[PDB]
Symmetry: D2
Subunit: 274 residues, 4 copies
């Protein structure tokens, strides 16, 4: 019965147009998808940007273009920019777009092996990013891939480095190298978070095949849900999705079947302390 | 992966306690139960969990009335599995609860313990559990073992060790949300499936969520390989404060959610195979 | 951190079922119980969970005999907390189980549900649970609420919501390992403490592990802030196949383990504060 | 009732002689400590080496000296060499001592932030180390700091990269950056491992204040236990330990109190598939 906030992670850094022909790459494509997602029930867009050639971008001008396009089509949507970017990107380039003063942005809470590579978040870089969030008055969404990252975040809170309260945690489950999205895991994580950061709220992203199991557990445990091509390009096993909005709409339908209302924009901002 | 695990839906259409005053759509007579069973089957149900009533709504244990209901359902929907309750109504004698196994249904419930049950006690004395287990062997009926608490899993495992229950694979029905029993919160259903895997590794399972626990138990079962029971016996509401129109309406919602997520419904043949009814 | 959580040890010295034939060292008479209570206190126990017996070993509920035992224990060890059982023996009437609250002990048990209990049923009808809860208020006695299954936690939480139990903080005693109840495996004790934290956030807890579950429950409790019950009522063996020499021997082992790990034993004053007995 | 294998991690890479005056640094000191630990109940020594000045070493000659000294005092002990070394050490230097053909050695299963630094185990380096274990016929002890590392190891098993069965996993709990040693966590990890790698055996190391909680849970769940100055220099809060053997002996006493037998050398080798 608690409202449900749906996030659409519409582009990401890695997904190709060859694999997912409906992948939005340009600001205009991203705005069109954001409108469809909003109408389907999404209240947050998790935003990565691309150059026209499809390579990942960290350019401030390009971020401003995408943010402006999305805002103009759906002024009420929450635009959450990524500070993760493409694995391997320099930390300075990942941090810089906070200067655009978005409403929300991601804050990655640890390092992990990530497929064939390593997604690096050095402890000193986490601290400097956390300080930049404060300086630009941006509300973090803290990305957690493993149990230990919750404790790490709790220590940064204790030290006064992360002062946001309530803090919003995004469990990102199913990375090869990170915690999987099996139900035991999501239950463990929400309970672990409740022990360590009792006032934190949470959402879950389930990569690939973990999208459905994470979503259905979150539905009935008060959690919020992320979906989209950044995490999963398939609507069913072996069946490419038509759009990010198709993925959002399924979650909206399930919420309607079970009687869990979707958050209004106002409710989403209240819950996320925006 | 859920795309490869057939889902068995059970409709517990009548029960012992639900009233026509609370749920105007409650099926009471054999004819009414047959009609509802057919609609439930068409909506995706493969098992009916059957209690019977007299025409005036009183719970019954009579063998003639059980046969009337069984035959009515079989005549219109022979494909569905008719699972007889041996739990019956509040305070019923154990003799009357056991007797209908002599009708040789495909399946019947075997309650695995005693618990406080609302304002009363649902009594299953250890010696009676044993004689009921013996009756399942005598009459060649497959049990569905009803579990309301952790310790009932251990109790069943002891009966298996003692050779009192030899059915393998054994089917366990978690019944969660009784006032006096374990609730249907997600932590609990996760705990129970994992506990069952430790104690009875080859057992299969279903969950029934009483009242407000219907939705949480169903969605967890969807994505953990469990099977799902619904129906007026357990829950008369489609949403909080919104009475369900029929048992089939409840079944159809579960079928729609399964279809959304790509989990196939068991065919009658698959339901019988999974439950070891052939 | 365990170095800062006092540990309350309870000795359940006699019980209703344990026999002198199995355990030659079992204390039966008030004098024997007093001697054992003193030795247990010296070994680290702060609470005695008291059942009484007639001289021939039969379980008793008589108020004159309860007063005799209580007084005998108080005379030699006034510091120990004497917690009266209201569970009593197999099949005992609820009237006789309730009556000793009129003796106004510091603490008494309040059994939170019915369960199969070995070959019998331990009956706690919902209406009787309520009238016992009412008696705790009438006689100004603090309850220790005995929980054998998950659903009993929910039942207690409902009585708190209804204002039937107003004791706060409430002390819960998990009793794990009864045949018919939840076992004392580590998964279970972890689940139960976490479930209790969700449902009754301010409750404190202890664990009793019947038989082979004594060691697993004790070591988990040591490092999770729980308190620990031991004694012949629950377990007559020091090791598998090795009879315990006394209840104090069991208490002393727990005290030694606490000392090894640096967890302090509660003083009598701390035990009373924690249990809200002042 | 199942036998208990105690491991003594006697030296490590970071502990100083100033903080723990009884820290063994030289091969001779390490041999003396190993004998005392063996007599107290230890069946495995987890071995890091130091130069005489106390800096961490990866020199093959120095490893051979330590291995020889320990072997000569207690021929029956199992000598498990570390391939973790000091955080920041080159992977080539970490891998090289496998050429000495020890009975067992550690195999770190992932990257994590580790205090102020990052303990790096690139996916390609994990693979090459796993292949070297096979080439030198060394049995791994696989070090796991987070849930996701279990899945990662399971994938390497599926691919035939890790073929050891039964595989021995060491949960290392309490690193700042890794999973903590709280009871919920250890219970979760043993159950998660049972789901993902059903025939694996396990031990736990609890860093610092997590030594006691991890040990007592392991005692009664069939797990094995690591202790020692590498992980914890305190016998009680604020009370420096006298020796690694003191730490081992407490665990032996608790095992004796509860009736869990210590593994004989033969039993330890059987359990660990040596
Ligand atoms: Mg399109
Ligand atoms: Mg010395
Ligand atoms: Zn992203
Ligand atoms: Zn029924
Ligand atoms: Zn008692
Ligand atoms: Zn090491």
């Amino acid at each position: 019965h608690e409202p449900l906030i749906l996030t659409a992670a519409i582009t990401g850094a890695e997904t190709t147009r060859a694999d997912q022909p409906n992948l939005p790459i340009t600001p205009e494509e991203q705005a069109k998808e954001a409108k469809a997602c909003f109408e389907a029930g999404a209240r947050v867009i998790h935003l990565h940007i691309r150059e026209d050639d499809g390579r990942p971008s960290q350019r401030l001008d390009r971020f401003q273009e995408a943010i402006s396009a999305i805002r103009e089509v759906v002024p009420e949507i929450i635009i959450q920019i990524s500070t993760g970017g493409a694995v391997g990107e320099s930390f300075d380039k990942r941090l810089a777009p906070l200067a655009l003063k978005p409403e929300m942005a991601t804050l990655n809470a640890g390092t992990l092996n990530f497929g064939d590579d390593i997604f690096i978040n050095h402890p000193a870089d986490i601290i400097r990013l956390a300080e930049a969030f404060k300086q630009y008055n941006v509300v973090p969404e803290v990305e957690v891939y493993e149990s230990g990252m919750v404790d790490a975040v709790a220590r940064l809170i204790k030290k006064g480095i992360i002062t946001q309260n309530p803090l919003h945690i995004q469990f990102v489950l199913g990375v090869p190298g990170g915690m999987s999205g099996k139900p035991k895991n999501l239950m463990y994580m929400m309970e672990h978070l409740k022990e360590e950061i009792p006032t934190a709220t949470w959402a879950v992203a389930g990569i690939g095949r973990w999208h459905i199991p994470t979503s259905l557990i979150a539905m009935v445990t008060g959690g919020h849900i992320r979906c989209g091509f950044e995490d999963n390009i398939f609507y069913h096993k072996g069946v490419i999705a038509e759009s990010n909005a198709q993925l959002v709409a399924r979650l909206a339908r399930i919420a309607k079947e079970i009687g869990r209302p979707l958050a209004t924009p106002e409710q989403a901002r209240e819950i996320l302390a925006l």
